[PDB]
Amino acid sequence: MVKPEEVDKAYEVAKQRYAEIGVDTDAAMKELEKVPLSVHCWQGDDIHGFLFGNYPGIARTPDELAGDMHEALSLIPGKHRVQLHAIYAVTDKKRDLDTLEPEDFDYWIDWAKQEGVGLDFNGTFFSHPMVKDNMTVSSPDPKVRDFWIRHGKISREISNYIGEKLGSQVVNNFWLPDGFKDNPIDKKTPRLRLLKALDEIIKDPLPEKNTIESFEGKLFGTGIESYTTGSHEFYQNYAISRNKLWTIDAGHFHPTEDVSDKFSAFFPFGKGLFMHVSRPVRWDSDHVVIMDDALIRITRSLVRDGYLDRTHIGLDFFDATINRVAAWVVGARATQKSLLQAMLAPIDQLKKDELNADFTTRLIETEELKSFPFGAVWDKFCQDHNTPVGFDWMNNIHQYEKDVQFKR
Amino acid sequence: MVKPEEVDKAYEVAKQRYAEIGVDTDAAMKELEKVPLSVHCWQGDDIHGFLFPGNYPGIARTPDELAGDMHEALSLIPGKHRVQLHAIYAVTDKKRDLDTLEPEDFDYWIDWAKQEGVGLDFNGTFFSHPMVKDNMTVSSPDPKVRDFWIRHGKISREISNYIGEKLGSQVVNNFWLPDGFKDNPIDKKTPRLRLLKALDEIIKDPLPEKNTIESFEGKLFGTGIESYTTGSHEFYQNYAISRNKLWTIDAGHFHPTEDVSDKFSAFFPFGKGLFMHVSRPVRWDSDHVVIMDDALIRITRSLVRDGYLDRTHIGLDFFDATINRVAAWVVGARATQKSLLQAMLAPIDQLKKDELNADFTTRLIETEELKSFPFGAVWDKFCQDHNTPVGFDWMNNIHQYEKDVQFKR
Amino acid sequence: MVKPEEVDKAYEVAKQRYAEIGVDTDAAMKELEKVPLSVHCWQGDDIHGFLFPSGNYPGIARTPDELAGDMHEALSLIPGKHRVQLHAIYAVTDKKRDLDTLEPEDFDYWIDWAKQEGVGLDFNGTFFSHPMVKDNMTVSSPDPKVRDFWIRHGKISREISNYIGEKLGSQVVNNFWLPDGFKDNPIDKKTPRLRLLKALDEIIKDPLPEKNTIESFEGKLFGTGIESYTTGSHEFYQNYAISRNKLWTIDAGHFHPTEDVSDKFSAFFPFGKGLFMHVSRPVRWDSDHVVIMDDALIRITRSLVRDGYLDRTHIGLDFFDATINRVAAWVVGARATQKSLLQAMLAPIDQLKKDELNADFTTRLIETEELKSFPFGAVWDKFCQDHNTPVGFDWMNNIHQYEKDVQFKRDAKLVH
Amino acid sequence: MVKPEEVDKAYEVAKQRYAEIGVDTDAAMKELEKVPLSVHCWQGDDIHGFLFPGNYPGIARTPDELAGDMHEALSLIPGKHRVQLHAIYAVTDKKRDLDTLEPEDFDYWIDWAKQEGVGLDFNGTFFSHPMVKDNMTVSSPDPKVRDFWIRHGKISREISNYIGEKLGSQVVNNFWLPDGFKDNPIDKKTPRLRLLKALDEIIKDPLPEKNTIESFEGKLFGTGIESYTTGSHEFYQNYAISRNKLWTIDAGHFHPTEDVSDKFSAFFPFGKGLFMHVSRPVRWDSDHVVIMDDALIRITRSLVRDGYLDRTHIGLDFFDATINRVAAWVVGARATQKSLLQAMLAPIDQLKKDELNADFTTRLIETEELKSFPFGAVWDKFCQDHNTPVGFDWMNNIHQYEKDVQFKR
Numbered sequence A: 001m002v003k004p005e006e007v008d009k010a011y012e013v014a015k016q017r018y019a020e021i022g023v024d025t026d027a028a029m030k031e032l033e034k035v036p037l038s039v040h041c042w043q044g045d046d047i048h049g050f051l052f053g054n055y056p057g058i059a060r061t062p063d064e065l066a067g068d069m070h071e072a073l074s075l076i077p078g079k080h081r082v083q084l085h086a087i088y089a090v091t092d093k094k095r096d097l098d099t100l101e102p103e104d105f106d107y108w109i110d111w112a113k114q115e116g117v118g119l120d121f122n123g124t125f126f127s128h129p130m131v132k133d134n135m136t137v138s139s140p141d142p143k144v145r146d147f148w149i150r151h152g153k154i155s156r157e158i159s160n161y162i163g164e165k166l167g168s169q170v171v172n173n174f175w176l177p178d179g180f181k182d183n184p185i186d187k188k189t190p191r192l193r194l195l196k197a198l199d200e201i202i203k204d205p206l207p208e209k210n211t212i213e214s215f216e217g218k219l220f221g222t223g224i225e226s227y228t229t230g231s232h233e234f235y236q237n238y239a240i241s242r243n244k245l246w247t248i249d250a251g252h253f254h255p256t257e258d259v260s261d262k263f264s265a266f267f268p269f270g271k272g273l274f275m276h277v278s279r280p281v282r283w284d285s286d287h288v289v290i291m292d293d294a295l296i297r298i299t300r301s302l303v304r305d306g307y308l309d310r311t312h313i314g315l316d317f318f319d320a321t322i323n324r325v326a327a328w329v330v331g332a333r334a335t336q337k338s339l340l341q342a343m344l345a346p347i348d349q350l351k352k353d354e355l356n357a358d359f360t361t362r363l364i365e366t367e368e369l370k371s372f373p374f375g376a377v378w379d380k381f382c383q384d385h386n387t388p389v390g391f392d393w394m395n396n397i398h399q400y401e402k403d404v405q406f407k408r
Numbered sequence B, D: 001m002v003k004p005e006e007v008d009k010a011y012e013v014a015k016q017r018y019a020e021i022g023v024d025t026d027a028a029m030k031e032l033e034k035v036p037l038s039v040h041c042w043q044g045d046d047i048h049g050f051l052f053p054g055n056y057p058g059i060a061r062t063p064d065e066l067a068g069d070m071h072e073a074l075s076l077i078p079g080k081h082r083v084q085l086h087a088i089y090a091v092t093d094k095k096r097d098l099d100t101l102e103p104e105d106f107d108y109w110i111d112w113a114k115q116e117g118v119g120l121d122f123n124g125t126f127f128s129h130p131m132v133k134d135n136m137t138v139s140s141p142d143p144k145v146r147d148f149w150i151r152h153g154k155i156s157r158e159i160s161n162y163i164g165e166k167l168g169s170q171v172v173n174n175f176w177l178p179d180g181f182k183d184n185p186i187d188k189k190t191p192r193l194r195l196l197k198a199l200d201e202i203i204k205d206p207l208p209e210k211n212t213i214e215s216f217e218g219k220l221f222g223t224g225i226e227s228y229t230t231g232s233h234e235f236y237q238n239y240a241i242s243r244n245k246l247w248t249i250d251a252g253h254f255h256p257t258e259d260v261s262d263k264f265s266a267f268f269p270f271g272k273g274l275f276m277h278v279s280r281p282v283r284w285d286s287d288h289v290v291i292m293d294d295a296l297i298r299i300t301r302s303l304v305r306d307g308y309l310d311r312t313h314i315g316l317d318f319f320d321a322t323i324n325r326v327a328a329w330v331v332g333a334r335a336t337q338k339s340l341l342q343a344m345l346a347p348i349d350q351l352k353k354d355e356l357n358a359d360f361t362t363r364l365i366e367t368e369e370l371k372s373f374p375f376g377a378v379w380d381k382f383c384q385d386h387n388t389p390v391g392f393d394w395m396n397n398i399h400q401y402e403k404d405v406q407f408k409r
Numbered sequence C: 001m002v003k004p005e006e007v008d009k010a011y012e013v014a015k016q017r018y019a020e021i022g023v024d025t026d027a028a029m030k031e032l033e034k035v036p037l038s039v040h041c042w043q044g045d046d047i048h049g050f051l052f053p054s055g056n057y058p059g060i061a062r063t064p065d066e067l068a069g070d071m072h073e074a075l076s077l078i079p080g081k082h083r084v085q086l087h088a089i090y091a092v093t094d095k096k097r098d099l100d101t102l103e104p105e106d107f108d109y110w111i112d113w114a115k116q117e118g119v120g121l122d123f124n125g126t127f128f129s130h131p132m133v134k135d136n137m138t139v140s141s142p143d144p145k146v147r148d149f150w151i152r153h154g155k156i157s158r159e160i161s162n163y164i165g166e167k168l169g170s171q172v173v174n175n176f177w178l179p180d181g182f183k184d185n186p187i188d189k190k191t192p193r194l195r196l197l198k199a200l201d202e203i204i205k206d207p208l209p210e211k212n213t214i215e216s217f218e219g220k221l222f223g224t225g226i227e228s229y230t231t232g233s234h235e236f237y238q239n240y241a242i243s244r245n246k247l248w249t250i251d252a253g254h255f256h257p258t259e260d261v262s263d264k265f266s267a268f269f270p271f272g273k274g275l276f277m278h279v280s281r282p283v284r285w286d287s288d289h290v291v292i293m294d295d296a297l298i299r300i301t302r303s304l305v306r307d308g309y310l311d312r313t314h315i316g317l318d319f320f321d322a323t324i325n326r327v328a329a330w331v332v333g334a335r336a337t338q339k340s341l342l343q344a345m346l347a348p349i350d351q352l353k354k355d356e357l358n359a360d361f362t363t364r365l366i367e368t369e370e371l372k373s374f375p376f377g378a379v380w381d382k383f384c385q386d387h388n389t390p391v392g393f394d395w396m397n398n399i400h401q402y403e404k405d406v407q408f409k410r411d412a413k414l415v416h
């Protein structure tokens, strides 16, 4: 086990090293504790839900998934949020996606109040017989369109209800699979069908204090490779023109595309972002978030340009090849330590150096900061917030495996 | 030498092949007539211009030389087209800088365009100048640099309005800035707020859409400016939609594997119009001559299938000084035209019906068969009907122009 | 329906057009006849096979007779003489078999069918969809019991391939593809590739006559659930093929974004024996779309034709599309490959080479662009008709008839 | 200025943190000492050389200036390293061309290397010359051009052999050719057969391996040569293995998303050795200064984990003239060293055992935790132990060198 004295000793030296270059480590940690991550429930049960890799101990019930999310949050320092999918409804009533009621989410409101977290929401527009040739809201079939418009409206009603009960705004994220496997003839009509359907879904006004909608594009998915109706361009344009949030998932863009570039091109025009951190490995593979170039650039671009107050950070990944609870903790800690490293830069001075075109100083300093003692500040943050330091939280995972997961 | 009676015979056979699948070749050729390509002047003289005086022989050095070279290229491109100018192609014996240009400095090109029977489009020149400070112009943090380039931007609109009034054809005034960073920036926000404010100042003075409208061209990366581009595609799509201006899509300026033909149908539920710059990137923004490849085929079929040509200006953008510079224009223009024509020769209404009814088998079979239908016989007919050489034959014209003009310079 | 005399007339015109630029259309069609495509059996039944019991289209093959019938139908619409690729799991026997107990006689069904059909056979060992796939690893597993099982399958694939080649009197290319790799970032990249090297050497050790069979080795950049590391890389297998005097398999879907596999041929053939070129359309990943006439296919085919590599390159199809008529999928991909080969053959290649050696890049650009709108379709139509296959749209009639007669009824038919 | 006591206090805590997970920080630093980086001379003078006479002040213009600049950079990079020369950095009062260079023309650099205490690597110069014809050299279809560049190739080996004999350290002699086509070629075979025959002629005359060995460097594409590269990565890996020579991997010269760290373990079952050129591509072969990024982290940890450093020569390759050219070297060298050191500070024996047991949970958790272990405290200790400044402090040295030397030029 890491000795708390060691953490304290390493921190006092780190505090001094950072002070010498005009950085306040105490202030950086206070900033980090204001950034909640929206932890996605569906990693816990391989997005099975309750309505309808192979590591042991998958959650099978609401109680099991709630316990698994409690365990993960207990190993993530600070206070965070949980994302639900519509299919995580908890009810003994026969429901379909077009007959869900707000009170079907009472279980999760009760849990969130006990846990002390806000909730965000996702409509479930997939894994259903009413998905016709990979299309839902923007299907050429009006029966199919009408079904999914009913689900869209219900997702807003559920979100409003949760937000009213919790006293925290529910971000209601819309993702559709809609597109073509092979090359389409008509690219225009599907996107005009989507525009009309979305305008219908958001028509009935709901209190902004309770919920606001975000819209998530994708470049391509398995079996839908050639055309995505809801493109990044379509949804940025839609978000700006309908005054809604735009969702950027770090896994859903071109090879070499840097999603951290988008923020400063959006915010002159738009309201807010839902930034979904996810690791693509050569496709939309939904690998666990790790400290890599993409995460470092996402977190430092939000910190440096002061966009955190208008940017919701959510996790999105599946990994069933590893301990599903560990997966949440790896991804959240990676995101947090990347935010903290960005906060531990002399940003005001670096901005002035850059304004004066001192590219020599900018390169030298940004490179030196990558080997400054940011880990000592992160360890101090973990310890101050009653979470295990470094390798130590593996003990907690092993105990949870023995006591809970391996007994299922 | 192709025999005209052979071209006519092969056309009548192709007309019948296409009629049998519900395609009217006569109508397709009338549709192609209505698509003018904006031919870029700067391929003729390696963007030297006249304002501030590969290695194939016969580069244009004077206005008369460049005007003659563009006349020769247009004589080998069937139908009616347009020419793009850069501000540095001003023709004047007065001492000018980019911030002191006057509309009359372009009288030479208005007179030439009237003679040639073509419209003109325009480009402000925001590069190759001492007032480019650390690769930044309009959105420089230096207010002296900003104010210089804002004066040029305002003057570009004044010139474009004047040309548009004189020609009675709308001048599309394309804005491209190099502005960005070689290496990783700290502040991505402030440069884009500087750009927003400066662009708003440039477009402030009211001018009639009838004479000119501005288009805004983004870039992912350029040589020596690799890490950050102030004017991103997202920034300019947002700006064009917000300010009711045109958005410029250059086929060479996007990510590896990015299909710019995807953008049109995501723009037109929101925006006014496009300036589509066809250009061949080879693994970077290399500005190769446009050829009939996946990208050009997808750009052209996406515009005709979805009926966007009436709101899309098509311009050429490439440099190739390793080949006959006049030939480069004709290859690019003909590649674009035959690609448009192939898209127009599809049974688009029936294919749309089959796709709406989820018959993806028929869509795949038919779209593949159409690639080996006799579209060439229709293209040859279009060339001959518009008094241009067929197939290989226009190399004779290039060789003669080399002998008579280019090789004597 | 096209009129045969219309096709013949359009051909005579195209023949004259090409003759005027020094191209012999008669000779081009004779060259195309000499390129057999190895049509993959597994598109017919979504790689189910018969050993262990995206797309939805009716009429999936469920039995050897049904698959054989489906391949016969597809081949009847593909002009000329071709080959069929088998997978080990397409063994036909009443005897209870595993991948390490298959016998050459288990492929007598396919030998008899190939002889009747007038096609050669290529072979693929099946190193996937099996309980003995341990953490996505087979031949190069760190578990010696798993390694040994898959080495037994590897040796059996060669014995089967040798037997088939002897019976058919046509060399069987025996293609090796392994899924082996990691989902996430590995610590040790060296040891898995040393385990692979040793296991492959053990599989090929016992000599078999080259006239009957030779092995080819297929690399991959990444697969679903195995994204971060592939034990059998393209570099590993090109090195292995050259050093062990075996063929190298290039699958057009298995490389980096923007990677042009047509670049590889001329860097391989100064050193290596032969290629198995697997034409496949990737759409943003290894999606195994039906082959279409696109930049990649045009470049693969013209690079093989221009540089005279067809005599040392076996061309196979590899794609999976169950969202469309599975029989039509074969015909689209086969015809796209053939018409792309034929367009390449209809170029004045000797003169274009001379112009290029003289650095006449102007003539090269103009002529290569003009050739894309020469009447290559009229030569393709003539080739289709001469080889008793339908012209252009006409083969959709044959597919609709096969749907009525076979595919739309098949699910309700008793399996036997 | 960082206090040595701060470095020592942080190191003692880090040493304990690492000891607790079975990692020996003292041993890791001894391992880093055995990895010399081959610092490229041509960053110092923007590849001008002396043979054929960004815009940051103080460019080196003479041998003494460039030698001084390399001494300054090496004085700020901890440990012992090497310097790479290009043929155009010949130092002589004699009239030379690339085909008349003599080994004694490098006596200047042998003497400098001995007094500096470094080994030398070598590069033939196959660019920026009238005898580069249509971007081709050794593999030109013109036998006059081929023969000129074959003579330079043979001379590069004679020079490398002579330097190796004098220094008693093997000179790695790296071959890079620009040879290729701007646009799509008809014949891909014949250029590569011309290259094969020409390279074989260059290496024909036996020279002692104790003095020199050749390495062969491929490229995917270069500016003005985008469509085809005669010397491909496949060609040269095949050539190196076949002719028992070294293969050069430049991290900037591959496809988008290509991970060159994948190549090592596919090469070493077959080949003799590598020359790894660390370089940062930004969307093309842009030759940015090496920084601590995914590519550098993967390159360094792949060499360390699989024990390939003793068969892999690590060289720098970048040119950035927009910043202090001496600082560029130090940023790139320190980035490479701290990335090697982080990889050396992992419990690799135990992680390999975990991975063999398919414990992917433990592998993910530990590899992520190690990214925020105190590797900087070990790096700082390495800097201090080897008499170089810690962290930001070496900017003081650069500012002093600017004042005293560079800005006086």
Ligand SMILES: C[C@@H]1O[C@@H](O)[C@H](O)[C@H](O)[C@H]1O
Binding pocket: A106, A107, A109, A110, A165
């Ligand atoms: C969310 C829901 O709200 C009311 O119906 C009650 O307080 C109930 O107990 C609670 O679960």
Ligand SMILES: C[C@@H]1O[C@@H](O)[C@H](O)[C@H](O)[C@H]1O
Binding pocket: C026, C027, C382, C386
């Ligand atoms: C070579 C070719 O063979 C068939 O296609 C026909 O007989 C045709 O007339 C002839 O040109």
Ligand SMILES: C[C@@H]1O[C@H](O)[C@H](O)[C@H](O)[C@H]1O
Binding pocket: A047, A122, A175, A216, A249, A316
């Ligand atoms: C599960 C589903 O996956 C989609 O690709 C997308 O990332 C959505 O946000 C998520 O709800």
Ligand SMILES: C[C@@H]1O[C@H](O)[C@H](O)[C@H](O)[C@H]1O
Binding pocket: B047, B123, B176, B217, B250, B317
């Ligand atoms: C010459 C200049 O080049 C730029 O890259 C861009 O394409 C502009 O549109 C053009 O005006």
Ligand SMILES: C[C@@H]1O[C@H](O)[C@H](O)[C@H](O)[C@H]1O
Binding pocket: C047, C124, C177, C218, C251, C318
């Ligand atoms: C079905 C299997 O798929 C692999 O990805 C590869 O393409 C192999 O060649 C094939 O046998």
Ligand SMILES: C[C@@H]1O[C@H](O)[C@H](O)[C@H](O)[C@H]1O
Binding pocket: C207, C208, C209, C210, C213, C214, C215, C244, C245, C246
């Ligand atoms: C001995 C003979 O060698 C060939 O190169 C090839 O590898 C054959 O398969 C093998 O049987």
Ligand SMILES: C[C@@H]1O[C@H](O)[C@H](O)[C@H](O)[C@H]1O
Binding pocket: D047, D123, D176, D217, D250, D317
């Ligand atoms: C300067 C030259 O640049 C090339 O692109 C390559 O990287 C060579 O190694 C180097 O010698």
Ligand SMILES: [Mn+2]
Binding pocket: A216, A249, A276, A316
């Ligand atoms: Mn998402």
Ligand SMILES: [Mn+2]
Binding pocket: A249, A251, A252, A278, A284, A285, A286, A316
């Ligand atoms: Mn995803």
Ligand SMILES: [Mn+2]
Binding pocket: B217, B250, B277, B317
């Ligand atoms: Mn452009």
Ligand SMILES: [Mn+2]
Binding pocket: B250, B252, B253, B279, B285, B286, B287, B317
């Ligand atoms: Mn361009």
Ligand SMILES: [Mn+2]
Binding pocket: C218, C251, C278, C318
């Ligand atoms: Mn394959």
Ligand SMILES: [Mn+2]
Binding pocket: C251, C253, C254, C280, C286, C287, C288, C318
């Ligand atoms: Mn594939």
Ligand SMILES: [Mn+2]
Binding pocket: D217, D250, D277, D317
């Ligand atoms: Mn290099």
Ligand SMILES: [Mn+2]
Binding pocket: D250, D252, D253, D279, D285, D286, D287, D317
């Ligand atoms: Mn480089």
